Amino acid sequence: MKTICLVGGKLQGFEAAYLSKKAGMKVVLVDKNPQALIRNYADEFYCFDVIKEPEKLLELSKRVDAVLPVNENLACIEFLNSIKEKFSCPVLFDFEAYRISRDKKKSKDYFKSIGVPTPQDRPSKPPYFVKPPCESSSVGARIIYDDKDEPDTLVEEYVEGEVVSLEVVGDGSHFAVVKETLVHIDETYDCHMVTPLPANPLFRQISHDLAANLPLKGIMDVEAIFGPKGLRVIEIDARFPSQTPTVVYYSSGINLIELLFRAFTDGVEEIENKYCIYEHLMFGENGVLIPVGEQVLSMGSDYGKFYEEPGIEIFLCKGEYPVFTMVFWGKDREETGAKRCKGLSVL
C-alpha cells in the first residue's frame, strides 16, 4: 500500500485525495488552515505551514511514497522548488512547466512559439473577453461589450464554442494524452458540470506537442475552445486539476493519480468508454437546487462523501448552504441520465 502526501486541502486536494483512494492509497494532508476543506476526508491531517516549518514536511517525506503539491500559492510553490532536492521521496510536480502555465501571457507566447492557435490579443471590435494573467477557477474572467475599458489584464477576442479540457501526463520522454472532457460554464464562466467527449485527433496532437516541447515531467491540462473558425487554445495549467479527473476516471478507466505517480517512478507510455455526468448543485432556501461553480464550492467548511450506490457518488460540501457534488456513470448517456435522476430523487 502506497501513501501520498498532499500539500493543499481545497479543491485540487480533494480531487487528488479522491483518486488516491480509488487507487487504494493512504492520503496524508498537509495544510496551514486548521479547518482546511478536506481535513476529514484525508486519512491523516497535519496542520502546519510548509514555508514556516519545512523540516516537518521533509520528515513526512521519509514516511510517504510521494509528495504532491495541490495549491496555487506561488510563495509555497516557489519555496518547495528551493528545497525539492532535500525530499526523501519524489515531488510530483514540474516547476518549469508551472512557471509558464501560471502566467497566461507567457503561456500565449509559448503557444505562438510552436504554432498553436490561440485567441487574438487586443481585438478592435466587441465583445472582448477579459481576465487576470495569473488567477484560476475563472476568478476575474468576464465578458465586456463595449470599448469603454485595469492593470496587466488579458484582453482577447471572445471565442464562442465548447470549452474542452485534455490532461497530459509526461515522464520527460513520453507524453500520455488522456481523455477529452466538456467544461460546462455558468453565467460567471465558472464550471458547474463536466462530461466526456469523443477523441479529437487535432486537439490530442496539439496537447501532445505542448507537453513534448517543455518537456513535461508531471501533469498538465490543456484547455481549448472549439470556436467558429477552429480550435483555439486558451490556457494550460501544469498542476493537478479539479473536476475533470473524476470524469476521466469513469469515462476512460484511467486514474490520473496512478498515471502521475508512474511518471516519476517507472515512466509512462503514450496512448473504457463509459459516460459520466459530474456536477455541483447548491441546496438553496426552501430546497431549491441551484447549479454552482468551483468558486462557491471552495467557500465550504467541510467536504466528504455523502452517499454511494452503483453508478452514483454524492459528496457534501458543508457551509452557509450545502453544496452537493454529484457523480454519475453508466455504459451510455441513457443509463447515466437514469442514474442522475435516481441521485436527484435521493435529494
Query: Which residues are annotated as part of the binding site?
Result: 10-12, 31, 49-50, 72-73, 104, 131, 138, 156-159, 165-167, 221, 223, 235, 237, 239-244, 294
Q: Is the peptide bond before 215 cis (omega within 30 degrees of 0)?
A: yes
50 binds ligand ATP (CB under 6 A): yes
292 is a contact residue toward ligand ATP (CB under 6 A): no
- Binding test (CB under 6 A) with ligand ATP, winner from 14, 15, 28, 32: 32
CB nearer to Mg ion: pick between 225 and 281: 225
Q: Kindly state whether residue 72 participates in binding ligand ATP, applying the rule CB under 6 A.
A: yes
Which of 167/294 has CB closer to Mg ion? 167
- C-alpha 122/C-alpha 129 separation (Å) is 10
Q: From the CB of 124, what's the least distance to ligand ATP, in Å?
A: 15
Residues 155 to 194: which contact ligand ATP by CB under 6 A? 156, 158-159, 163, 183, 185, 189
Asked whether position 49 contacts ligand ATP by CB under 6 A, the answer is: yes
Give which of Mg ion, ligand ATP, none residue 244 binds (C-beta under 5 to 8 Å, depending on kind): Mg ion
Question: Min. distance of Cβ 52 from ligand ATP in angstroms?
Answer: 7
Q: Which of 263, 293, 282, 330 is nearest to 186 (CA)?
A: 293
Please pick, from the candidates 20, 138, 195, 251, the single residue that binds ligand ATP as defined by CB under 6 A.
Answer: 138
* Shortest distance, position 177 Cβ to ligand ATP, whole Å: 17
Q: Which of 20, 137, 246, 325 touches ligand ATP (CB under 6 A)?
A: 137
317 is a contact residue toward ligand ATP (CB under 6 A): no
Q: Binding site for ADP: which residues?
A: 104, 131, 138, 156-159, 235
Task: Figure out which of the listed residues 298, 323, 339, 343 binds ligand ATP, where binding follows CB under 6 A.
Answer: 298
- For 296-312, give the secondary structure using H, E and C: HHCCCCEEEEEEEECCE
Question: What residue has cell string 458543508?
Answer: 318
Q: To the nearest whole angstrom, how small is the minimum distance from the Cβ of residue 248 to Mg ion?
A: 6
If binding is defined by CB under 6 A, does position 15 make contact with ligand ATP? no
Q: Which of 30, 97, 178, 312 binds ligand ATP (CB under 6 A)?
A: 30
Contacts with ligand ATP, residue ranges (CB under 6 A): 7-10, 30-33, 36, 49-51, 71-73, 76, 119, 129, 131, 135-138, 141, 156, 158-159, 163, 183, 185, 189, 223, 225, 234-235, 237, 298
